[PDB]
């Protein structure tokens, strides 16, 4: 039930958000952000430096003084703000799933569906968070009265990737603001602008100036200066592990600001031989091939059971074959294009290595178009653990499928690799289900599905996938200091 | 009540602790500790290295396989085991308080009734905690049984100071081996004897082989060694915001194993003008003074306000030169020697700092004994917040007392520091008892009392105090991987 | 900031709301609902009896049936429709302050103000925890997988009064709601009309038909059929201790239904000597006059230390002669008339006893109009804890001063009563303001202020004023049924 | 390995205990307790009545008064006599074995390996959560600062059966001892010996007299006493439906004292086609014949899917023969006496309703012996759901065997029960197991496991089975009253 999109449509925020006005660079530079469908620019964004994030920075310290509206406004007070812009959201729904197709490239009934969906679930849910994050009255030995504040941990940077702008923006937001932080967020240079407008909902919505501001811009620049600066209290970083490092080397080297990481992974899918044929093959197929392969918890590493083998592969390829690659507008695609020429290349690498190193590709393997990053849907089979397409996340529509033999054996083959964000099981017996859901080192393990997000279930990596979680509950431990106050009293009694 | 002391306490053990057995360093070198009462080499203990630290790591791994003793055992009886312990601990505390404080210079009578107690008590409440950390059940959208898991972190690196040798040790393993983990742990240079002692008790407690590991040695070594290394989970350290800052830096360099801080301070202790003239002075007096000076929270900047300044500052000086400095191990002695010569010297080079920069020296000053690393209990009045005794942990017998007239100005005063460990409030009113505790940025607020800890109540830095809660349910947090449990079911209801 | 009300707001709903329909009782019978402030009828109401209630408990556990929309439904959906409702609700809000004020008597200022605003806070709180109340995966002895799933109690009968009646159905409804219950609700009598018109938007909203019943009716006949009712699962009952104890008994003689309970207070407010005299002043005077002294809560027992005794009297006199009755719609009323004539007869025959029993009646004593039932504010000074002015509930606008003279003395008098719904503390002094907090045996005590609600904080009594809580996460409690799941595994691992 | 019993073991107490002493009742009336293997009498016992009673509240509620012992202890050190406790009760475990077998008639090698065991696991488990019941700090609308006390409920009477009687003590004082409480406890008067030898641990543990008093005599007296009193603040009763409604209508004709009620049930065992044939029919066999079918949550439906029916019955009725009835200090005796004469008439006349209501009798169906209280494991087939011994609970060795078709039907069945305190699923099917756990109305559905108790898991009824849970967490509850602190702040700030 999709309204129809309109397939350009017009940009209203491409400056830095800082105190809920629209400014340009220090520098005035800008940079282009593209279409990648097209490979056209869209428009010109301004580009963010260290001098901007320092604006940025002090704006939210401002903010987040004691005393300051932000931090006398009541909890629940939050929560209806949160609201609010949930129901902004919602009311440009169709012009911001459009803006997302635009300039990510994700099919816009996807984006609709699917993204903006997900972000007004986000925001709603953690919305409801805001009054309800109790700390603790502790029944310490002694004459005392002893309990914890859980006070907002400050300060948070945020840096977030391009294959969900609006989803990470939303992941990030929600349980900072419910907990009553500030932001100074970094988005991604492919994708600045559906965040961007976003700002302006906030400031619409009522958020006081400096609670939350945002800084386009490149990484090792902007993102830096965020991860490095010594007034951000807390950094929280999506993104490849190798960036993962820098930015908890620089969180060391600077203040020793807080860190949370997600992380990349290559998320073993296993399909025992007692499977629902069809729906796992479908499964798997949407486990891999989903967003353009560009998910950090892809099915990249799929184990199928021997004795399925050979029809399970069969089963892919057709499917895979049957993808519909193209227009990201057209409501018939399945599958738009990868996010920039970067990546393009970087897929169309993987691929030829697979090739190189002995896999069987049994389809696609190359380009799918003439204009725009869009490439076939592509799967190799007889994959071996030490083949390079195995061990690294491609970030692409390449599909691994390897064949194993035992419970065991697949147990202890899954489990190796420095990733660890997510797994999944396909079978039909409980035991077989409930000893692979304990043995598997994932964040995540689905069972008989794959990539269900839930709001209230958290999510994050095992290993260097990541560290800490996002969403649920636990979404929140990263964004709270915890305060003991100990109170010398009369005569304590129980 | 305190048993006669043998002040000559035999070693038993001086070795690297793995597998349950005594193992010299593979290098064969050792390195000697020394009682700072005497400047004497108690004995020669193992110079634990990166090889060595390697077999630690892998026998902890190896511990930690699924299906191992230690992973397949009850959580309940994780608990019996920790109990177990802290009863060994006890039937020997006599003889651990006496080379306590033959190793470390701390008074006999407290390293007994304080350090031990405290020991224990730490002990037996994770005990309990080892079958009551529970995961959840989450309400998700859809059609899914969606659950966490929380699992063991995995191999934990903790790196523990000298000022609290078995203490620190207690509230490193307590919240570890509660929820399962298992450790490499590195002890202090200066402090080595007790831990290494208590290892035995681990073994004889009946802990699984590979479950506790103990590695002495030097920081840059051994330390390093387990910061650095890719096996290794979690690191937990203990010691100098300097030092910590190499351990964030190392995590990010290796693995992206986890981390948490407890750094130093530099602790403001505010007295109101309507505070309890008595208790605030001995209880000031106490909290900088408390095991020599060296504790991370000392209250090493009194804030006194002007109304009661100077009667304040002469009652201080008074308890402060009838302080008992002398052998530890005399029941008469408030105050034994500095840990080593390193901080003697430091100590020293501070107090000549304080004199050099226009504090008033008010009493002590110079060195107390011409044996051994005896200071002399020192105060200083009229210090000035640019000082740099009023910027820097001295972490010795060094008092700092400052002015102030308004509640309002205190708050930015003690809040106006890279510090955050702790603070404290002394005042008999309401309103200003609330508007301090919540203003202070300080990981713990004490209220008309000072340093009191309870294993109950969580413990930790603000700012570059450190990051990350020991004590109370909070402690169990760092120490457990949370794991989402994804389940398709028939159909979902409430 | 308050829009003028319509003074005779239309009546659209005076009939049994059962499956989202409006019926006629099965026995045609009606009673009418009266206008306080004139006496005069404002419409007639149908009349539910056993059988209508039967039908209504019907409905509800057809709407509660596995597989059912209501059973279905998406945790946070529920959230939404919660949100939903609040949102119609404050689309509604003038009428509906008016027509509460129309059929309850307070003033309109305050409907719109205070019981509106309560209402929305309430709703949208609980609205939030739709999604978050989750069950617990559990460590148990053994290779088993244990865990608890939080599940509805399921069928909700619902008793509430007349003194909040759109404040009371929302802090029934939300929790009961939030965690998947359906509901049967007898509203009060004298109270119908504006939780019939609430049903409505229940309606509108979007809730399933038969999630939400109402039964208006008599206490003996409808009230009795829902607390004696053989497939109601639990009740919740606020009114009279009195009344409290036949629903429990219900309960027990019936099908062991899970039962919470409400009650009434005669709640001490303590005024120690060093409190700031003019708010305590003023504090005291809302405590006990609210609407029209009809609260459970109410500040029925003024203890004022001998130092300030008179000069407390004196300044509460003043404010009591002050304080303006009249026409609940003008803006100048303070207090309007008692609910019905049956309380106004009640409250004159208090009065009668203080003044027979020996009490100073220091002002008013007597009826304020002679139309509607208005009462003159009353004090009596000199009270004493005997005087059974000093002992009963009284509910109306008579305030009772004692006078004490040690903190011991006061909090044994304070605690020496069968009730203990609530307690207020009035002091400056840290010590004293915790020694009494945790002294008193309250389920609220408030601390220099009186009658605070927080939708996030629980409010429940102590002894004979009640069992159980609402509001809060505490509020949840009572609508949830534990079931633990225990399944045996291959082999259990930490 | 189990330690030789002594058949005869010395009876050291049979008084009343009151304040750590013991005590003849005030009418020096006594009762004979009967081994139920020969009929002969044991002893006799102290019959307390009403004035007894009135003794040990008088008593409970002096050791609960603010300031005492009880009051003042830390948490922590109630949880240090919770393990001590244990750990006496370990010491004199055979002793304790011996005695419970002699009075009760289970199994000496079952109440050694069980019932001790399990005791000890409860007692222990409690002790962990001493200290660490938290209360709350609430993020409150408005200027306040907000938090709730865990306090403790009070004096609790507490009423336990003679099926479990060590356990059910375990049960009941674990939870309100760690929670701080005092307890009035009423032993069933068939088996009140060990509980009495357990007052003499608790008073050698070091309990505060007055903590924990025990009350030996009979129900419609002693019971009837505690239940009515008013000045008990919470009553938990285990034991019939019939009784559980005479004490919560006798709390709701008291003082509406707070209650929580572990009554009967007719739990339903279904076994799936796809089951693990032995393992269920051995299963099945324990989930009914355990402690000589005495357990509330005995599997006295097992439901059988048609295409397995025939089997299992054989199998089922081979297993039943084969069980050794016998002397119960016999290692190779699988089942004892029942308890009583008046249970042993119960159960034959249940086992002829069945025979005259045309239940096919396979075996057993008579005495069993000809001293003592010995009955034939006895096993109906082609049971019907309109049969009395389908409905209604024998609490002997009956077994019901009845016949289903489909999943559907069977839950419908299953639930078709005023009683819900457990049920279990034997399948291998992963959604089968989850659609029926979801689908059971009961407090706990085990799946391939029968009677699988962890001190960490709850446990209680749905419907007519009872009210509130014990163990885990959850136990901890209804012993604690929840009081909520607001104090005014001079200005709140996140
Ligand atoms: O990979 C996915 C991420 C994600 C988030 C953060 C990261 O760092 C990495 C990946 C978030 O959401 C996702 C939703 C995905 O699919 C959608 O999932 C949702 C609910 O799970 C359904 O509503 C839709 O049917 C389905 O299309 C697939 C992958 C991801
Ligand atoms: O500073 C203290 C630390 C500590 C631990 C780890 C760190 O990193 C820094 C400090 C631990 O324990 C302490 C106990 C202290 O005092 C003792 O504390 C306990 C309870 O607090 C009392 O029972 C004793 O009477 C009192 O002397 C004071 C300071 C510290």
Redo the contacts with the bound molecule.
């Keep these: 039930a999709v309204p129809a999109p309109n397939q350009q449509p017009e940009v209203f925020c491409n400056q830095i958000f800082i105190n809920n006005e629209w400014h340009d660079a220090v520098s005035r530079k800008t940079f282009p952000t593209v279409n990648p469908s097209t490979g056209e620019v869209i428009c010109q964004v301004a580009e963010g430096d260290k001098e901007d994030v320092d604006k940025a920075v002090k704006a939210a310290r401002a903010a987040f003084q004691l005393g300051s509206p932000w931090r006398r406004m009541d909890a629940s007070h939050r929560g209806r703000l949160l609201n609010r812009l949930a129901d902004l959201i919602e009311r440009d729904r169709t012009y911001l799933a459009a803006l997302e197709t635009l300039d990510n490239g994700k099919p816009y009934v996807?984006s609709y569906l699917?993204d903006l969906?997900?972000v007004l679930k986000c925001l709603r849910y953690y919305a409801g968070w805001a009054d309800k994050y109790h700390g603790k009255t502790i029944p310490i030995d002694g004459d005392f009265f002893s309990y914890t504040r859980h006070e907002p941990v400050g300060v948070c940077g945020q840096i977030i990737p391009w294959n969900?702008p609006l989803?990470?923006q939303a992941?990030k937001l929600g349980p900072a603001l419910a907990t009553g932080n500030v932001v100074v967020m970094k988005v991604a240079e492919q994708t600045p602008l559906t965040a961007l407008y976003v700002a302006n909902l906030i400031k619409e919505a009522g958020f006081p100036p400096g609670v939350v501001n945002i800084v386009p811009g490149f990484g090792p620049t902007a993102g830096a200066a965020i991860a490095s600066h010594e007034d951000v209290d807390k950094v929280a970083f999506?993104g490849s592990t190798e960036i993962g490092r820098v930015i908890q080397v620089a969180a060391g080297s600077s203040n020793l600001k807080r860190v949370t990481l997600?992380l990349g992974g290559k998320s073993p899918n296993i399909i025992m031989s007692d499977a629902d044929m069809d729906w796992a093959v479908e499964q798997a197929h949407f486990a891999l091939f989903?967003?353009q392969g560009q998910?950090?918890?892809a099915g990249s590493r799929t184990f199928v059971q021997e004795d399925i083998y050979d029809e399970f592969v069969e089963r892919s390829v057709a499917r895979a074959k049957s993808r519909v690659v193209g227009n990201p507008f057209d409501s018939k695609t399945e599958q738009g294009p990868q996010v920039d020429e970067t990546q393009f290349k970087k897929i169309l690498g993987y691929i030829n290595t697979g090739k190189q190193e002995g896999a069987k590709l049994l389809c696609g393997g190359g380009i799918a178009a003439d204009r725009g990053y869009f490439i076939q849907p592509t799967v190799f089979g007889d994959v071996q653990d030490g083949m390079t397409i195995a061990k690294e996340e491609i970030f692409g529509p390449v599909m691994q499928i390897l064949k194993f033999k035992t419970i065991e054996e697949v147990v202890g083959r899954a489990n190796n690799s420095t990733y660890g964000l997510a797994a999944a099981v396909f079978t039909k017996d409980l035991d077989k289900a409930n000893y692979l859901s304990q043995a598997l080192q994932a964040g995540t393990v689905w069972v008989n599905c794959y990539?269900?997000?839930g709001a209230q279930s958290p999510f994050g990596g095992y290993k260097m996938s990541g560290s800490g979680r996002e969403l649920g509950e636990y979404g929140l431990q990263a964004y709270t200091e915890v305060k003991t106050v100990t109170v010398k009293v009369p005569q304590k009694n129980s």
Excluded: A
């Design positions: 996807i699917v969906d997900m969900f989803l990470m992941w999506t997600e989903f967003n998910c950090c918890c990539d269900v997000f």
